[PDB]
Amino acid sequence: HRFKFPVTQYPVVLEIFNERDKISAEPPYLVTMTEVNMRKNWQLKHNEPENVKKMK
């Protein structure tokens, strides 16, 4: 997949599949992003509701 210069607000939609259903990723299922090629010119923006302030 090809992208135009600045890629802004690219949505990372994460779906959990559970045989019968596929639900969206929940705040209990906290996640980490890494860049396997070691590049570091990228940013990730996220909202923190008062359900993970302590998990995080």
Partner 1 sequence: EIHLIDVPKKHHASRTESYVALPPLVSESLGFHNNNTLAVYQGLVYYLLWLHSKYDKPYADPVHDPTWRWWQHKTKDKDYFFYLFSNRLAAEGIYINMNAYQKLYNMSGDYGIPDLFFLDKGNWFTI
Ligand X SMILES: *[C@@H]1O[C@H](CO)[C@@H](O[C@@H]2O[C@H](CO)[C@@H](O)[C@H](O)[C@H]2NC(C)=O)[C@H](O)[C@H]1NC(C)=O
One character per residue 16-35, x = contact with ligand X (rule: CB under 6 A): --------------------
Selected binder of partner 1 within 2, 4, 40, 54 (CB under 8 A): 54
Q: Which of 1, 15, 28, 33 binds partner 1 (CB under 8 A)?
A: 28
Instruction: Output the CA angle 29-34-37, nearest 5 degrees.
Output: 155
C-alpha 27/C-alpha 44 separation (Å) is: 16
Sole binder of ligand X in the list 1, 2, 46, 56 (CB under 6 A): 46
DSSP structure class, residue 51: T
DSSP letter for 54, please.
T
